[PDB]
Every structure is written in structure tokens, then in C-alpha cells.
């Protein structure tokens, strides 16, 4: 509880580098089994990296990654950690930890870290610009709304985009980023709503780069006069 | 490694249809397969593990089957939260290998879209664009044309598109389209609008402004 497993934020990282993603077990005794590696590249299957034993330390792995990925665990700070060198392109990918249940290695996955987007690029962090997309100019008539904010311009993913400070969650349609051919992302989100509240209620949507340690809080206000 | 292929790559079914997957080790592997869930943007969820052993929590209407070398998941009466990629893995053999995917969409009856267009804000058109967005809301299945026309007929090549994966509630997909200029070129014209074409509808809508607002 916080989670069960739970992982460190998206980075980007400079091809030839290296990442250290971490993974916080809490709730159960960690040193009673062995966690897992797992990446899962765009639009490729999940391809098993490595496993560690929180009890002894000890290590197995996959041997396309021979000679450049390290597992390592704080069994104080019940945290285990991957290290992945000599970064190439190909290693942007979610990489999660997952809970072998019974210590041996050799195993199903029954708990699975949320994941950590490593982005391996050049190109620098840029936090987003949010733009309102205000309900109307004058349309109502039927009996809903919708409004709604634009993120634009950031790199790399994620964004995460709140509505009311996660109070309002139905009718939430929070779209996939497109890359535009600059290189940054845009995504929006819309809310669809009963009109009769766009004049009782305030909309705020809370835009979350992680990346650039962005917060925004943007009132979608009416296209007003 | 040992492969694993699973059998389709992608099914469309109706709720309450039974679907069945398969899954080839490309060897024996006894028992040792477990079937995960996942659902667009998160993480992997075990369901089936030792072939046909149910997780804790997981609803009855999945089951597996299979030894050695052929798998099965069966999903005996399909339900819209049951939209997913699903997965199997061996752990017979290092590296432990998982198959391709089958994605489950849901079929269902055709809704047609709320559509809603959305004009350049104030503080974007400080910073020299303008984006304009035109929302389709709520619809099935999931073809729909959108023609952008600015200055009437002078309908447009310069927009991006995203949709949404398919709701676990009531299988719809919603669709944005963004048409981006530059302030220049957006005060230079004045009717901006969408124009919308889906099976659903029974004439193409159109959603335009004026720029010019009020």
C-alpha cells in the first residue's frame, strides 16, 4: 500500500548512456521472493531482461542484454534497481519489475510495477504550453457541452492531465500524443459536461510533465465576453 | 528461446460470444504457460497460471487449457471490460518468452458522433499559431472521414488525428482532429469548419465559426 510495486519516473537519456530504474516493494516481505525485469518496446511484445533474488542478491538474466544490464537490490530500503548501459534508440521502451511468487526465478508474474518510459534521444526536455479549448461561443441547445485543454509542444512522454483535481472523472477523454514533425508532442483532453453547471462550476484540467517538473492548473472558462 | 505464437493476432466479437485464443510453444513446455491481460496503457495482469489455474479475483468466465505444446484461453461470454491485449508466457526454459498478443475489440451497434469544433485561444494566437480542434464524440465503429474547409470549399491538407482505445463501459471510440496554421494564416480567413461522415449519421455534419467569435 502506496502500491505493492513501485517504480521511478520517465527519463530521457542520451544515446551511449546509461539508466538505473528503480522498484519499491512495500506491503509483503521483500526479501521472500525475487523480482523480475520486463521491457515491452512500441508496438512489440514483452521481452523477459533479467531476475533478481531479494534474499541472497543473486542474478539471472537474458543474455541479449550480456555485458550491459546490472540488477542490484537495498534490501534496507526494500528497492530493487536495473542498471542498463550503452544505450541505443531501440531501448526506448516501459520497463517494469513484476513479482516472482515463488523465489526460484522460473515463474508466472502475479504483482507488476506500473512502469518506466526511458525515452533514448538527443533531443532536450521541453515542458508543455496548455491552451484552453473553451465550450462554446454561444452553442448549448440539446443539453451537453464539452470543453477541454490542449498540451503542446513538450518531449519526451509522458504528460498526465487531471480534471478538478481528479474529482471529475467521468467523461474524461484523455487522447493518445501525436508526434508533429518538429519532434514534440501535443495530446488533448475533453470533458463532456451538462451545461446548465458551465455557469455554477469551474473546470480546471492539471497538466503533470514529469520530465521537466512542469505543473499547470488551467480554468477552462467559457468563451466569454 | 522457445517461441511462442499466439492464434489470431486481432478478433472483433459481440458480448456474450464465446472467443478462444491459442497459443504454440514451439516445444514442450508441460504446464508451465500463464495468460496475462492487458489492457491499453497499463501494466500486464495475471490470469491464468500452470495452464489452467485461475488467479485469485479473476471472474470465472476465463479458463485455459493445454499441455506440452498447445494452449488455450477461453473466454466463455464476452463482456466490454474485456477489451484487451492478452499474452502468453512460458517459464519452461530461460529466457522466459512471451507470444505476440491477441487484441479482443468488441463489436456492437452503430452511434453516431456529437461532434464539437473549438477555435484558436486567446494566449495561442499570442504565441504566432492557432490550432483548431474538432471533437467527435462517443461513436462505433470506429471508420469516420473529417474535412476541414476554410473559407468554405477550400477544404484543407494540414491536420493530425488521434482516437481513443475502445471504452470498457460502452465500446465507443472518440476522435480529434487538429488543424494547425499560423496567426498570420488564420487572420486572413473566416469561416473555419469540420465536416463529419460516419455510418451513424444520416447526412455529413458540419460544425463551423466565424472568426471573429463574440
Known amino acids: 500500500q502506496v502500491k505493492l510495486l513501485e517504480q521511478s519516473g520517465a527519463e530521457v537519456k542520451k544515446p551511449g548512456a546509461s539508466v538505473k530504474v528503480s522498484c519499491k516493494a512495500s506491503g509483503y516481505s521483500f526479501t521472500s521472493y525475487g523480482l523480475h525485469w520486463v521491457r515491452q518496446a512500441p508496438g512489440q511484445r514483452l521481452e523477459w531482461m533479467g531476475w533478481?533474488?531479494?534474499?541472497?542478491?543473486?542474478?539471472k538474466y537474458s543474455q541479449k542484454f550480456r555485458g550491459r544490464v546490472t540488477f542490484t537490490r537495498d534490501t534496507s530500503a526494500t528497492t530493487a534497481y536495473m542498471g542498463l548501459s550503452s544505450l541505443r534508440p531501440e531501448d526506448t521502451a516501459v520497463y517494469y519489475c513484476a513479482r516472482d511468487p515463488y523465489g526460484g526465478g522460473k515463474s508466472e508474474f502475479d504483482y507488476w510495477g506500473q512502469g518506466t518510459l526511458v525515452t533514448v534521444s538527443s533531443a532536450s526536455t521541453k515542458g508543455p504550453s496548455v491552451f484552453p479549448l473553451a465550450p462554446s461561443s454561444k452553442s448549448t441547445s440539446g443539453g451537453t457541452a464539452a470543453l477541454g485543454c490542449l498540451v503542446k509542444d513538450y518531449f519526451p512522454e509522458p504528460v498526465t492531465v487531471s480534471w478538478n483535481s481528479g474529482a471529475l472523472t467521468s467523461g474524461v477523454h484523455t487522447f493518445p500524443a501525436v508526434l508533429q514533425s518538429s519532434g514534440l508532442y501535443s495530446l488533448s483532453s475533453v470533458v463532456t459536461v451538462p451545461s446548465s453547471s458551465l455557469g455554477t462550476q469551474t473546470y480546471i484540467c492539471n497538466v503533470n510533465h514529469k520530465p521537466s517538473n512542469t505543473k499547470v492548473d488551467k480554468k477552462v472558462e467559457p468563451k466569454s465576453c | 528461446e522457445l517461441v511462442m505464437t499466439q492464434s489470431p493476432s486481432s478478433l472483433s466479437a459481440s458480448v456474450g460470444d464465446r472467443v478462444n485464443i491459442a497459443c504454440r510453444a514451439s516445444?514442450?513446455?508441460?504446464?508451465?504457460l500463464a495468460w496475462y491481460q492487458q489492457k491499453p496503457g497499463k501494466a500486464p495482469r495475471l490470469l491464468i497460471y500452470?495452464?489452467?489455474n485461475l488467479e485469485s479475483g479473476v471472474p470465472s468466465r476465463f479458463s485455459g487449457s493445454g499441455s506440452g505444446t498447445d494452449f488455450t484461453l477461453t473466454i466463455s461470454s464476452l463482456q466490454p471490460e474485456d477489451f484487451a491485449i492478452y499474452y502468453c508466457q512460458q517459464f519452461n526454459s530461460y529466457p522466459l518468452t512471451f507470444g505476440g498478443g491477441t487484441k479482443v475489440e468488441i463489436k456492437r451497434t452503430v452511434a453516431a458522433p456529437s461532434v464539437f469544433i473549438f477555435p484558436p485561444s486567446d494566449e495561442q494566437l499570442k504565441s504566432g499559431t492557432a490550432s483548431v480542434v474538432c471533437l467527435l464524440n462517443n461513436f462505433y465503429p470506429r471508420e469516420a472521414k473529417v474535412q476541414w474547409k476554410v473559407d468554405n470549399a477550400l477544404q484543407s491538407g494540414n491536420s493530425q488525428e488521434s482516437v481513443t482505445e475502445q471504452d470498457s463501459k460502452d465500446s465507443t471510440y472518440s476522435l480529434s482532429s487538429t488543424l494547425t496554421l499560423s496567426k498570420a494564416d488564420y487572420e486572413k480567413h473566416k469561416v473555419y469548419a469540420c465536416e463529419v461522415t460516419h455510418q451513424g449519421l444520416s447526412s455529413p455534419v458540419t460544425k463551423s465559426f466565424n472568426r471573429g467569435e463574440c
Open positions: 500452470d495452464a489452467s
Open positions: 516445444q514442450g513446455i508441460s504446464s508451465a
Open positions: 533478481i533474488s531479494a534474499g541472497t542478491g543473486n542474478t
